[PDB]
Amino acid sequence: LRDALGTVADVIRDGRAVAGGGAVEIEIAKRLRKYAPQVGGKEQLAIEAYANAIEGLIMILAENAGLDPIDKLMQLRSL
Amino acid sequence: LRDALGTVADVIRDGRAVAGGGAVEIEIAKRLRKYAPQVGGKEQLAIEAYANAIEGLIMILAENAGLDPIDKLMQLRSL
């Protein structure tokens, strides 16, 4: 109960909110893959290797609830 | 000399010609990566794994003439 209240306080101290469920990771993994071609050098492989590691988080969320992980990633990315 | 003549005969028997030097591979590796999103299923990973294996040929051409292979691939793809 006090951890719930101390989460409401983390909203009220800074008035933004974002969806759970892995909805944030897949917008970030779009912005990076559109930004990486501007950086151009060997550094381009390190940014795209960052994006693959953030999407690689919500597999650990799907794989954990009994689902088939890869298809239930591909459906979200296509959506 | 007869293998040279028997190459001119391979042009004359069918009146098309294409550039050497790895110029064909990098147009094919563009068409495939634009076509793969239409196929959509697990099969999409097999087509993109085909494109990476055709570009992977001209590294064996650059790596062989003493050059640094990766950058001399990236310059061609950007061009």
Question: Cβ distance A10 to A42 under 8 Å?
Answer: no
Instruction: Please tell me the total number of residues recorded for chain A in this structure.
Output: 79
**Experimental method used, please?**
cryo-EM
Instruction: Write out the two tokens for B1.
Output: 């000399």
Residue B53 contacts residue B18 (beta carbons within 8 Å): no
Residues A6-32, buried b or exposed e (16+ Cβ, 10 A)?
A: eeeeeeeeeeeeeeeebeebeeebeeb
Q: How far is CA B1 from the centre of its chain?
A: 28
Q: DSSP readout, A55-75?
A: HHHHHHHHGGGT--TTHHHHH
Residue A6 token pair: 């101390």
- H helices present in A1-79, as ranges: 2-12, 23-39, 43-62, 71-78
Q: In whole angstroms, how far apart are CA B23 and each of A55, B30, B72?
A: 34, 12, 13
Q: What is the distance in angstroms between the CA of the first residue and the CA of the last residue of chain A?
A: 36
Task: Say what the resolution is, in angstroms.
Answer: 3.6
Q: Are A9 and A44 in contact (CB under 8 A)?
A: no
Q: Is A22 left (phi over 0), alpha (psi -120 to 50) or beta?
A: left
* Per-residue DSSP letter, B20: -
Determine the Cα–Cα distance for residues B22 and B27; give it in Å rounded to an integer: 9
Which DSSP category does B69 fall into?
T
